[PDB]
Structure formats: C-alpha cells, structure tokens
Curated annotation (Swiss-Prot), chains A, B:
Domain HIT: 1-106
Subunit comment: Homodimer. Interacts with UBE2I. Interacts with MDM2. Interacts with CTNNB1. Identified in a complex with CTNNB1 and LEF1.
Gene: FHIT
Protein name (record): Bis(5'-adenosyl)-triphosphatase
InterPro entries linked: Dinucleoside_ppp_hydrolase, FHIT, Histidine_triad_CS, HIT-like, HIT-like_sf
Pfam families: HIT
Lineage summary: Eukaryota, Metazoa, Chordata, Craniata, Vertebrata
Length: 125, 125
C-alpha cells in the first residue's frame, strides 16, 4: 500500500508513516540498519517537493536516524540523497539513505524484512 | 561573523543566510559548486537540532541545491551529511554537502572564494 517509484511496498516492511513521509527497511542493506526514508508523494527530484514535504521528510529522517543508531549500536550516522541520474539514483523517488555507523566499518526474505521492521516499529510507539 | 565549528567564516563567502541557516562556498571543493549548508546554531549532531532548524536547514538545502545545479551545469545533485565521528565528520557542526553532478565526472584564495559567492548570491536576490 506504499509505493517507492515503480515498486509497491508492503506495509509490513514500512516502519513509520508520517503525515507526508514514510520509512522502510532496505531489501539490500549496505550496513545493518540501512534504512531509507522517502516522501509519500512519488516525486523524482528533491526540487519537485513542496516546502512542507521537505520539512517532513527530513524531520522524519532525524527520528529514523536516531532510532537505527540506537538499535544497531552505531556510534554515528551517514545520510545521503542521490538526486537524479548522474547523482546515482536508480529508483526514481526522492529517498534519504540512513546508515548507522561504527568504527572501522568500511536480497533478503520478505519475512526477515518484516521482522526487522516490527522490531524498529517498537521505538516509535 | 558566521561560525562553522571552530572556524569563523567571513560574510563575503556566505552566499545565503536564512532565519536559522546559512550557506557558504567550500574552501576545498571536490567538484565545482561543492557548497555546504549548515545551521546558524553550532550543534555537532543532527539530533541536537530543533525541529524547525531541521526544516529550515533542508529547505535552504533544496534552494541552494537547485542554484548550484544551474550555475555549474550539473545534470543532477548529491547531498550528503556526515553525522558525527565514524560517519566521517571533521569539523563539528551539522553541515549538508551539496554537489552539482554531471556525466562521467567520477585550498583556494579568499578573494576567489568571495567571487564564487557574490556570483551565487545573485540567484537568491
């Protein structure tokens, strides 16, 4: 019931849904707790977003960031948005990448994904 | 009259100053038009920022992004925040990195810097 570009994503994978934004667990994390926040509206470029969507996206990204930093024992975080092709974008939907980071740190089952989600979902209760 | 962590930065280098945020030209760009937006308040971690500071930071980052994309003929953009040590942070102040990106793309004088600024300053007029 959520859409991330072309793909439609199952609620039981989405671990937060705000008034205009939503977060989901990655189905190919780079580092554990690699989650991604994106606006509900399917825009392709950061600039097509309204001012409020922007404020909601990054506020939610603040929270989501804190949470996955706690749960995956990362000491710090790394945020990154690939805005348009040539930036590195693949799926055409504004999305913030969130990576919990530890020291010297340099697909997946749709039942495992749903687990990591319900697990995270607990912190926003 | 602006401070970025330990360093104090000269107005004539800062190319936008909003109610709570400000942008400046980099004094060691990775790619031309590598600019950085940061909150006026000297916090060290994304989470210490108030909700409004967050909304203002990334709204301003939307604008600043568009502008440097136009002026440096980048086809797309890349945003990146290094939140805390282990993330990669060096100067301890929340700052968004903005990079205008073109295809196959893989210090500086305080008079040159001031030029690139006044130049950018023109788009926000």
């Amino acid at each position: 019931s959520f859409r991330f570009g072309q793909h439609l994503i199952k609620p039981s994978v989405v671990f937060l849904k705000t008034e205009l934004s939503f977060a989901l667990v990655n189905r190919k994390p780079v580092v554990p707790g690699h989650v991604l926040v994106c606006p509900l509206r399917p825009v392709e470029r950061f600039h097509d977003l309204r001012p409020d969507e922007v404020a909601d996206l990054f506020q939610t990204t603040q929270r989501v960031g804190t949470v996955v930093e706690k749960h995956f024992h990362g000491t710090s975080l790394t945020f990154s948005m690939q805005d348009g092709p040539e930036a590195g974008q693949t799926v055409k939907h504004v999305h913030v990448h969130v990576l919990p980071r530890k020291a010297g740190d340099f697909w997946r089952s749709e039942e495992e994904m749903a687990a990591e989600a319900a697990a995270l979902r607990v912190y926003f209760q």
